[PDB]
Amino acid sequence: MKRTFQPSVLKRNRSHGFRARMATKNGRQVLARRRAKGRARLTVSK
């Protein structure tokens, strides 16, 4: 039976990618928090 995660690379990048984060100030704030914490993988692009 159909589960919730149906992978799609294009939709993944368009929803959570780097350029989607950078497009709004709240996305940029997400990136700032993740840099301050020190995540190795900053977004889903990597």
Residue 20 CB neighbour total at 10 angstroms: 15
Contact 31, 22 (CB under 8 A): yes
Q: List the one residue from 11, 19, 35, 39 that touches RNA (CB under 7 A).
A: 11
39 binds RNA (CB under 7 A): no
Cβ closest to RNA, residue 10 vs residue 40: 10
The closest alpha carbon to 43, from 11, 10, 9, 20, belongs to 20
Q: List the one residue from 25, 37, 41, 46 that touches RNA (CB under 7 A).
A: 25
**Contacting residues toward RNA, per CB under 7 A:** 1-11, 14-15, 23, 25
